[PDB]
Amino acid sequence: DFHWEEYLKETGSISAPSECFRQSQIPPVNDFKVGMKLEARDPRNATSVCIATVIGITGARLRLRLDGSDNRNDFWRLVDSPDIQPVGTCEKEGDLLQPPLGYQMNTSSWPMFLLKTLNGSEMASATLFKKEPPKPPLNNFKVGMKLEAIDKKNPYLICPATIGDVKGDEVHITFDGWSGAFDYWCKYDSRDIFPAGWCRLTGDVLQPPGTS
Numbered sequence: 001d002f003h004w005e006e007y008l009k010e011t012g013s014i015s016a017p018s019e020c021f022r023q024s025q026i027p028p029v030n031d032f033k034v035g036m037k038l039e040a041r042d043p044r045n046a047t048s049v050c051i052a053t054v055i056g057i058t059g060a061r062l063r064l065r066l067d068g069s070d071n072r073n074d075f076w077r078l079v080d081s082p083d084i085q086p087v088g089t090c091e092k093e094g095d096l097l098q099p100p101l102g103y104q105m106n107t108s109s110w111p112m113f114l115l116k117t118l119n120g121s122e123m124a125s126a127t128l129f130k131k132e133p134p135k136p137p138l139n140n141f142k143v144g145m146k147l148e149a150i151d152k153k154n155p156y157l158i159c160p161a162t163i164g165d166v167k168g169d170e171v172h173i174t175f176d177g178w179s180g181a182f183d184y185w186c187k188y189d190s191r192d193i194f195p196a197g198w199c200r201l202t203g204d205v206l207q208p209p210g211t212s
Contacts, residue, residue, distance in 0.1 A: 002208045004196045015196035016145035022189035027202045028080040028130035036124040041083045043075040048098035049090040059204020066100030076155045080130040087123045139188035150192040159207040177210025
């Protein structure tokens, strides 16, 4: 099994301090249940908020699917992500819920599909949406530091990664044991990167380093 304390000694490296990340020192608890409804910004259309159903639970993350669309574009969001909110938030903020990109019906049917889908469903209580963590004021990451990062090619996977480079407010995430094809640059305050030990603390799944 994988253990950071041992891996760090094996690779002769150190893990990035938790203060470097925009993640809560004490991870948020996940009280959501599969089947619950909520609002989520369309991963394929940021300007649109759609109705989403919880398909799965993993650690402090939710596997979501936009109601009215197929099951081939599911995405993962932390319970304290600003991209998810309780039903009713969109309108309360003066916006209008949008059909998902990939909606299987005619746009005009959206109004009734909405009531239908939300009818007799369990709306995730606001109590389930945890407080957003504070943003570290500066990028404190240093090249070589290790962490846990989401493989954006396979979002369900969180893997051992290293800060390959630092440029201003950006960091170059590289995946231990895998080809550069999975690497990516992101803002230091990205919600897709976590301090070593995050998966263990949240009950999520941390992939072992690549065997290639």
